[PDB]
Nucleic acid binder design. Structure first.
Ligand SMILES: [Li+]
Ligand SMILES: [Li+]
Ligand SMILES: [Li+]
Length: 1223
RNA sequence: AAUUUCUACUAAGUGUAGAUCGCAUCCAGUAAAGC
DNA sequence: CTTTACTGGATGCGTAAAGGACG
DNA sequence: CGTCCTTTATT
């Protein structure tokens, strides 16, 4: 109640409502007969074409400056960029260059005298008719002579490219903010990593790529940046890091690939280079050579038959390649060699049926020489054999034959395998023989034809495996004796079998591309600015306006021939009438007031004093050093008077302006003009005459519609349906505004009506919810799946503006802090991410007490005593593998983003219900860019989506049950998050949302606050002795069958964070440890007390004998100390989880609380209403909430002027003192 | 298994509950197969 | 390195009346 | 000379 009511009418945001439009009467008939849709359909294809040529001219104009630009003082900026210590005044110096570098580039585009005419009608009527050289491209631009204003929104998309500000679409942004920092950051890495590069390695990149035209060290110089400003230069720059592939097909390595190889052999971490992003609008042709994909279905076939049939050389290559293996014995068994790699364990199996025998046979050879009888199997001898067994490049056929135990002979069993593999290829041809015939004609498009592709995929994979098998027989020699009589034939065939590798590529890239589909196309009705705005004065100009016949709204469109048809209509007293809109709007007071009252047309009529004309030009009314109060007043009084003399403004609106002596800035005056400048009203217009204007075809008319508008619906409306009703409701005092810019699309059907999945009428359908007690619905009418796509649909996109005039103006992050300082029992919601639970909620009160905790793997809703629980976590898993296995098999890739978004809508609702009920703030994890990456297949892309749709919902929060006119309803929705502009603008707090660090959120004891600040990984014998002696005591407690480890953290290093210091550890409980190598489980449950006893017996230790600290240090053997750490590590292994297993994810603590009992999360997961976390996941969210409860505690001390100075970001040291004092 | 549209439904009969910012442009990211 | 897919973040607009060109 | 398309103006 109390907190939420304050946040209404806070800021201005826009949304868009969408509606199926349905033609009224003869409207569609006259539309078809006048071919209006086909002209817009043909236009929307031509409009994408004219835009392509327009990009051609922009890119040319773009590169005229970027080729010849040289940046002033680029070096001087770069030095400041890599400064190790910048001061806050020195900090300000770097910006002004960076601001001027964008200014230097941005003005260089504008500096051309042809800049301004790139975004006016001249570019289509004049400039592009000159630049273009095609006779057809010249004609597609003439057809658009009428329509240049239809490009206005496209010209806006192009002036952003020439912006000077830090805007993501600006070219100046790309070159300086993005390319430079990446280039300069690479500049620092090269100096650090110059060491590893061989002089030939430097030259090989120079030889292959740079052509010795410049050296590699040249690029990382400051003054060579001007090369990479263009896309053409970047491709060369990105090549140094990435490399490229020549025409000759050699994979040249790049500096980033070399850094990895050094790091993989020496196990160090040197950073890799960042490639540079492309430049705006570049038509970038890649440098690496590739064979172009097939244009059409017919090509793919004609390649597939000709290249793969029996006659084709590729099959002939198999037909000869087998002959060599059948003739294998004839050639020297020392002249043929099997290459060495990891793929040779498979080879050992294909002969004698076992993988590791070829490895194990050779390991007996390397051992006997290099195994002196003392060792027998030291780690070095076992490990060194791994070094030798991959260094070997190949194996002689005779060297393999020696390994095998008789009778088996490699060459005879090699002759066995290959006949089998050529036959399996022969078998796929048997199934696929129909594809090859000259006659055969395809039933369905290749992408719609899963049956024909699986046939191609089967023949291609059967040919791919035989080749991929044979490739290992090359041996990369480089070999002393090669039975070159054999290999010469072998190379002749295999190089021709290598031709499939391009075909497997190109075909995969054709078959797997999404099928052709017809996008919806905007309707214009022969007007470039059709339906731009709703103002009644413009109704003739735009030619579309809204009508109302009770509970149904229509969209009327007046044909070009009859622009003023609806204006001559008057009320009919007796017969039926429509309600016709009388929309009136005054957009942009700051722009519209000077435009009209300083215009040439009215500059004479209003004679503004000589003072005025200088006041506006000198900008004395604007706030700043220029601002004068009385000067601004003179503009306000001038604008006030001239509006009163203005007829179409004064009459249309009812204007109340507070005394000019009361305004503090010109913004205050424009705001009232903006606020009082909008009026929506209706008039009466005869139904019989309007309907006559439809049948005549002078007026087209569609009904605005969604399913809530049906006369068969008795259910709660869609949230957007409410907004639409409110726009014209008389109780909407400007909260929601009908804005201009609507569009009307035509989406032709994409499915056939008869073919759809139909549940036949009067035949019982089965219900899928196992809780629904009615398992059958017998309907008297058909249910077509996706019926909305089986017929042509009209689309109407109506933008609205919510709170265009914000009354309540204050800082939201501050007002949240003010009310948390004064809430006696404030509530906090805790939301925790995971891979075992997608989202987990924990709700706590002002004292840290748990009221609610449940996982959100499954969404539960009840309606009218009907429960339904949907396992959205299962749906995301099955749909994920329905794309993985779809990607492998070339099949269709299912969409999952809708599913994820559909999941969030149920979650987004549940938090808002929780926020409404408990009046609770929200607590999320502080994640920067890095944490998005995950080791295993990730749904945490759901988490990033969870934020967006949550923040968006809180931006205007509505409950569809509250009365719209009441607070929290449709007209007065809550706004409890700062307006969403970008993810990068965010701070630690966003209104009710707090992004809090996750350190020590999970691996902490909720019962006591205990944490593992110990490092236990094994370093040496000596450190373990210093380890043990630090403890206050190590003892055996026999009456409890536990070991007790009392310690003071102050004796250990890097333990400053903990508050209590004095902790007594225990071996209580069981832990989980992962193996390092059949067996039932890949993990085991170690019993701690039953393992300390174990360890203390192996080295003859009297653990019973009082304190054991001196006793354990007595030992002199490494195996005792290296094993002790594992026992030590498990005691502190608070969180025990196992991958992929439902049962295991529990938190167990080694400390006794105030009542002497350990925290086992399992002793809670059984409870329904637990008072502590049930699992390591809920423990996270619980602490995430408490981290904020600490932040609320900070707010309780400070004073209302200074809450902005309160920092919500917890220090690691304050949090431990709080988790241990709270209990 | 209907939907402005998405998700889950059939919810008592052409639908139910929740959510839904469109349009255009620039850019990037992930997965997969081949090399 | 490439190619295909699907997916998402950051920008602009969400306008009437002046302006001009045109038959 | 009225009509339809193009430009414009910045709290
Ligand atoms: Li509804
Ligand atoms: Li995926
Ligand atoms: Li179904």
């Amino acid at each position: 109640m109390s907190k939420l009511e304050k946040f209404t009418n806070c800021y201005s945001l826009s949304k868009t409502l969408r509606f199926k439009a349905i033609p009224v009467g003869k409207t569609q008939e006259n539309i078809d007969n006048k071919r209006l849709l086909v002209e817009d359909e043909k236009r929307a294809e031509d409009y994408k074409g004219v835009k392509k040529l327009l990009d051609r001219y922009y890119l040319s104009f773009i590169n005229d400056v970027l080729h010849s630009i040289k940046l002033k003082n680029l070096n001087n900026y770069i030095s400041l960029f890599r400064k190790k210590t910048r001061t806050e005044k020195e900090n300000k110096e770097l910006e002004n260059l960076e601001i001027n570098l964008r200014k230097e580039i941005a003005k260089a585009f504008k500096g051309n005298e042809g800049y301004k005419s790139l975004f006016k009608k001249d570019i289509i009527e004049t400039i592009l008719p000159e630049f273009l050289d095609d006779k057809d491209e010249i004609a597609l631009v003439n057809s658009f002579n009428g329509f240049t204003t239809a490009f206005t929104g496209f010209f806006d998309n192009r002036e952003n490219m020439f912006s000077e500000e830090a805007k993501s679409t600006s070219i100046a942004f790309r070159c300086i903010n993005e390319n430079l920092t990446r280039y300069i950051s690479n500049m620092d890495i090269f100096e650090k990593v110059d060491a590893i590069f061989d002089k030939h390695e430097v030259q090989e990149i120079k030889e292959k790529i740079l052509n010795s035209d410049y050296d590699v060290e040249d690029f990382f110089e400051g003054e060579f940046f001007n090369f990479v400003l263009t896309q053409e230069g970047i491709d060369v720059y990105n090549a140094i890091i990435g490399g490229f592939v020549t025409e000759s097909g050699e994979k040249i390595k790049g500096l980033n690939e070399y850094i990895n190889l050094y790091n993989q052999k020496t196990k160090q971490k040197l950073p890799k280079f960042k490639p540079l992003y492309k430049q705006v609008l570049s038509d970038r042709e890649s440098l690496s050579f590739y064979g172009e994909g097939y244009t059409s279905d017919e090509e793919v076939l004609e390649v597939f038959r000709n290249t793969l049939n029996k006659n084709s050389e590729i099959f002939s290559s198999i037909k000869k390649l087998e002959k060599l293996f059948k003739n294998f014995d004839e050639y020297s068994s020392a002249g043929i060699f099997v290459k060495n790699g990891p793929a040779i364990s498979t080879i050992s199996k294909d002969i004698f049926g076992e993988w590791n025998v070829i490895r194990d046979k050779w390991n007996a050879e390397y051992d006997d020489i290099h195994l002196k009888k003392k060792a027998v199997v030291t780690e070095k001898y076992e490990d060194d054999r791994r070094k030798s067994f991959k260094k070997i490049g190949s194996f002689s056929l005779e060297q393999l034959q020696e390994y095998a135990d008789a009778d088996l002979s490699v060459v005879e069993k090699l002759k066995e395998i290959i006949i089998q593999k050529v036959d399996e290829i022969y078998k796929v041809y048997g199934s696929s023989e129909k594809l090859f015939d000259a006659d055969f004609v395809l039933e369905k498009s290749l992408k719609k034809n899963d049956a024909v592709v699986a046939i191609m995929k089967d023949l291609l994979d059967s040919v791919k495996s035989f080749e991929n098998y044979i490739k290992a027989f090359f041996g990369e020699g480089k070999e002393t004796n090669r039975d070159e009589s054999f290999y010469g034939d072998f190379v002749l065939a295999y190089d021709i079998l290598l031709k499939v590798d391009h075909i497997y590529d190109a075909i995969r890239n054709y078959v797997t591309q999404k099928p052709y589909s017809k996008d919806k196309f905007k309707l214009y009705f022969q007007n470039p600015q059709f339906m731009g705005g709703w103002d009644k004065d413009k109704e003739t100009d735009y030619r579309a306006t809204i009508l109302r016949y009770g509970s149904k709204y229509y969209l009327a469109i007046m044909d070009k021939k009859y622009a003023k048809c609806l204006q001559k209509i008057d009320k009919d007293d007796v017969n039926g009438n429509y309600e016709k809109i009388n929309y009136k709007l005054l957009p942009g007071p700051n722009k519209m007031l000077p435009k009209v009252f300083f215009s040439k047309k009215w500059m004479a009529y209003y004679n503004p004093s000589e003072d005025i004309q200088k006041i506006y030009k000198n900008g004395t009314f604007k706030k700043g050093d220029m601002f004068n109060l009385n000067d601004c007043h003179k503009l306000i009084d001038f604008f006030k008077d001239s509006i009163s003399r203005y007829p179409k403004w004064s009459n249309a609106y009812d204007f109340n302006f507070s005394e000019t002596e009361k305004y503090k800035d010109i913004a205050g005056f424009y705001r009232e003009v903006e606020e009082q400048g909008y009026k929506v009203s209706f008039e009466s217009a005869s139904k019989k005459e309007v309907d006559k204007l439809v049948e005549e075809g002078k007026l087209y008319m569609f009904q605005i519609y969604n399913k809530d508008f049906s006369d068969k619906s008795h259910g709660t409306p869609n949230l957007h349906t409410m907004y639409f009703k409110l726009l014209f409701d008389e109780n909407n005092h400007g909260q929601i505004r009908l804005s201009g810019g609507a569009e009307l699309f035509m989406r032709r059907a994409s499915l056939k009506k008869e073919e759809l999945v139909v549940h036949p009428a009067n035949s019982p359908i089965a219900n899928k919810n196992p809780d629904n007690p009615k398992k059958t619905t017998t309907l008297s009418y058909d249910v077509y799946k996706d019926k909305r796509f089986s017929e042509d649909q009209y689309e109407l996109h109506i933008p609205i503006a919510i709170n265009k005039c914000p009354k309540n103006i204050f800082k939201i992050n501050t007002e949240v802090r003010v009310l948390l300082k004064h809430d006696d029992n404030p509530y906090v919601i805790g939301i925790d991410r995971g891979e075992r639970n997608l989202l987990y909620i924990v709700v706590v009160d002002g004292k840290g007490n748990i009221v609610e905790q449940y996982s959100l793997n499954e969404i539960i809703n009840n309606f009218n005593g009907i429960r339904i629980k949907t396992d959205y976590h299962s749906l995301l898993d099955k749909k994920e593998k329905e794309r993985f296995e779809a990607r492998q098999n070339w099949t269709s890739i299912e969409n999952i983003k809708e599913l994820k978004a559909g999941y969030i809508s149920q979650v987004v609702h549940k938090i808002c219900e929780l926020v409404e009920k408990y009046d609770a703030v929200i607590a999320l994890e502080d994640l920067n860019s890095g944490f998005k990456n995950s080791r295993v297949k990730v749904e945490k892309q759901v988490y990033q989506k969870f934020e967006k749709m949550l923040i968006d919902k809180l931006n205007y929060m509505v409950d569809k049950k509250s009365n719209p006119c009441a607070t929290g309803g449709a007209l007065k929705g809550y706004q409890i998050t700062n307006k969403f502009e970008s993810f990068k603008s965010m701070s630690t707090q966003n209104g009710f949302i707090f992004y809090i660090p996750a350190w020590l959120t999970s691996k902490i004891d909720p019962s006591t606050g205990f944490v593992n600040l110990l490092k236990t990984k094994y370093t040496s014998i000596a450190d373990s002795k210093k380890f043990i002696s630090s403890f206050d005591r190590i003892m055996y407690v026999p009456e409890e069958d536990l070991f007790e480890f009392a310690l003071d953290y102050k004796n250990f290093s890097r333990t400053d964070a903990d508050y209590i210091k004095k902790w007594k550890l225990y071996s209580y409980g069981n832990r989980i440890r992962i193996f390092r190598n059949n067996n039932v489980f890949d993990w085991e449950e170690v019993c701690l007390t039953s393992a300390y006893k174990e360890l203390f017996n192996k080295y003859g230790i009297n653990y019973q004998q009082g304190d054991i600290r001196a006793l354990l240090c007595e030992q002199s053997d490494k195996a005792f100390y290296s094993s002790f750490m594992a026992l030590m590590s498990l005691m502190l292994q608070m969180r025990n989880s196992i991958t992929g297993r439902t049962d295991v994810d529990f938190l167990i603590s080694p400390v006794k609380n105030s009542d002497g009992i350990f925290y086992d999360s399992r002793n809670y997961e059984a409870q329904e209403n637990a008072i502590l976390p049930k699992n390591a996941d809920a423990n996270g969210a619980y602490n995430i909430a408490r981290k904020v409860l600490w932040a609320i505690g900070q707010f309780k001390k400070a004073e209302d002027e200074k809450l902005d100075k309160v920092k919500i970001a917890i220090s690691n040291k304050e949090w431990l003192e709080y988790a241990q004092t709270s209990v």
